[PDB]
Amino acid sequence: ETTSLLLCIGNNSSGIRSRHRSYGDASFCYDPVSRKTYFISSPKYGEGLGTVCTGVVMENNTIIVAGEASASKLSRQKNKNVEIYRYHDRGNQFWEKLCTAEFRELYALGSIHNDLYVIGGQMKIKNQYLITNCVDKYSVERDNWKRVSPLPLQLACHAVVTVNNKLYVIGGWTPQMDLPDEEPDRLSNKLLQYDPSQDQWSVRAPMKYSKYRFSTAVVNSEIYVLGGIGCVGQDKGQVRKCLDVVEIYNPDGDFWREGPPMPSPLLSLRTNSTNAGAVDGKLYVCGGFHGADRHEVISKEILELDPWENQWNVVAINVLMHDSYDVCLVARMNPRDLIPPPSD
């Protein structure tokens, strides 16, 4: 009896009153159908992953997180790397190191079939830091890496989703050399598609807003982009604001349309990973931020976008999540293999 759960994976350990055992090492999970809370082991548990940056659930239901080693682990290693872990969930539940990649930050993690893609981000190339266009592909099956076709532009803090076995990279930061009185980077409203059978990136229809730190989810092969920081149109230096905008993309038709705006402007997680997932044809935003300060506690509330009714519903308030988390993921889980909520 497996069911699809919203897993709010993070290594934050605060904000949950725990009398008999420590929930500081557990991550909040939510069944939106039964409205029941579960807990899964956080990636840091034991000698695991110190920092979580992003994650994916691959086609075969494997839960993947990518991040950085703890300072203790770094101190015993010669090189700093992107560290990729996978959750193991068959009565012996744990996080295991899967594979490592050349260090980057603010990259996006994609997945198609049995492959992982590390996309863009900031890297150190010839002892200089720059936003990159490079895309590294990891084959789980062959346990090796291949540099594939690069992005058509340098991107950081962008998002990626998969629809019908293609990657769609969305928004983010990109260098600009058009205007000498503008910051070095501008926000992007661009949408790029990667076709793995062709190893080729193409430019698709753009977003109405240039943006970053927004929610993403896929419902019935359409992309939902919600909230974020940005500005209408191409970013030419105009002021940036928190958005309630919902933009929905259809790949087959290559067009965007608006959705019902969110109840309030909302930012995704500070990792720029998604705070939203899709369960049974409905979209769930699991918490979010109303401002961009580093000290704001995440809103401990779960919103639903019912795309059929075409409206927003409050599903749950004051949920038992930590003060932050690092990536919202949906996977088929057997909730008997998970940790119950605290007895209080």
Strand order in the sheet with 159-163: 159-163, 166-170, 191-195, 200-204
* Chain Cα centroid distance, residue 334: 23
Taking the C-alpha atoms of residue 135 and residue 115, their distance in angstroms, rounded to an integer, is 12
CA–CA separation, 162 vs 18, rounded Å?
Answer: 38
Name the experimental technique.
X-ray
Helix (H, G, I), strand (E, B), or coil: what is residue 129?
Answer: strand
Written as one letter, the residue type at 59 is: E
15 CB burial (10 A radius; 0-12, 13-18, 19+): middle
Q: How many CB atoms lie within 10 A of CB 51?
A: 18
Closest Cα to residue 26, out of 258, 315, 341? 341
Contact status, residue 145 vs residue 91, Cβ threshold 8 Å: no
- All domains in the chain, ordered by first residue: 5-337 (2.120.10.80)
Please answer whether residues 16 and 327 qualify as being in contact, where contact means their C-beta atoms are separated by less than 8 angstroms.
no
> Among 215, 267, 271, which residue's Cα sits nearest to residue 65?
271
Using alpha carbons, select from 317, 324, 320 the residue that is nearest to residue 342: 320
154 in the Ramachandran plot: left (φ > 0), alpha (ψ -120 to 50) or beta? beta
> What is the C-alpha separation between 69 and 220, in angstroms, rounded?
36
Contacts of 74 (CB under 8 A, 6+ apart): 80
Q: Reported resolution in A?
A: 1.9
- At 8, list the tokens: 């709010």
Q: In sequence order, which residues have a C-beta less than 8 Å from that of residue 175 and are 6 or more positions away?
A: 130, 131, 154, 184, 185, 186
- Give the distance, in angstroms, between the CA of residue 103 and the centroid of all CA atoms in the same chain: 18
- Rounded Cα distance between 186 and 194, Å, is 22
Q: Which of 209, 325, 219 is nearest to 261 (CA)?
A: 209
Query: How many other C-beta atoms lie within 10 A of the C-beta of residue 236?
Result: 12
Tell me the H-state helices in the chain: 71-75
Residues 82, 104 contacting (CB under 8 angstroms): yes
Q: Which residues contact 37 (CB under 8 A, 6 or more apart)?
A: 28, 29, 30, 31, 319, 320, 341
Provide the 3-class DSSP secondary structure of residue 1: coil
Lookup: tokens for 266: 């909302």
CA distances 260 to 70, 72, 245, 275, 306, Å, are 41, 46, 8, 18, 10
Asked if residues 228 and 272 have their Cβ atoms less than 8 Å apart, the reply is no
Give the count of beta carbons closer than 10 Å to the beta carbon of residue 217.
Answer: 23
Residue 312: beta bridge partners?
305
Q: Which of 74, 73, 100 is nearest to 86 (CA)?
A: 100
CA separation, residue 201 to residues 4, 197, 318 (Å): 32, 11, 42
Distance CA 278, CA 196 (A): 24
Q: Which of 135, 161, 153 shows the shortest CA–CA distance to 214? A: 161
